[PDB]
Symmetry: C2
Subunit: 123 residues, 2 copies
């Protein structure tokens, strides 16, 4: 059994982070003592957040993990939807890059603010 | 001269958005019971174009300060856009790596239960 400080140390995260996850309903119930189940939960959360998952996605995955008898098809759908999201964002960012490159080309090294091609194209 | 509602109509933005920009120091003082004029409209349009090019409120604040000083060199405007381009390029690299990571995750499950789920099991 561990206090929150020792749990945080073992999970390589701050006490305030553990308390954030508690306030968001991501940790099972536990002065308050914690054990191996809580540590493994924190590690699971950590790996999900490192794969860009939101708290809502993690809450859904945890609910499925807690119910081993349920079908896991929705897990595949969650990851597929995330992949689709990232692909759309990449397209948007490339278009933004090209837009900004065009903006940059509108001005040179030796001008005043009054003559600035960037400021003038934004006006 | 215009009230805020008319200014918002002309700039194609909400009154609350105008007030947000005011609270953030992005708009000059009202022309005159607050009244606005053409200068405020052109400012809102400038802000709109900047935000559509992914600029943050801090970058916009910087650009506005340089716009308000026409006698200065505009070299720092070029540097601001160059730094933004560099930022976007790094983000694109990170996102592509994330995409490839998520594709690998998805490949780990391929009519199973949660107990046997390859995705859930790889995250445990
Ligand atoms: Pb699955
Ligand atoms: Pb310039």
């Amino acid at each position: 059994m561990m206090r929150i400080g020792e749990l945080g140390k073992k999970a390589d995260c701050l006490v305030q982070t553990v308390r954030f996850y508690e306030s968001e309903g991501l940790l099972p119930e536990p002065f308050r003592l914690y054990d191996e189940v809580h540590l493994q939960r924190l590690l699971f959360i950590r790996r999900c957040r490192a794969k860009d998952m939101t708290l809502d996605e993690i809450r859904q995955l945890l609910n499925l993990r807690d119910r081993p008898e349920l079908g896991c098809g929705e897990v595949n759908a969650l990851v597929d939807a995330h992949i689709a999201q990232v692909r759309t964002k990449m397209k948007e960012l490339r278009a933004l890059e090209r837009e900004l490159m065009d903006l940059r080309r509108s001005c040179d090294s030796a001008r005043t603010s009054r003559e600035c091609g960037i400021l003038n194209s934004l006006a």
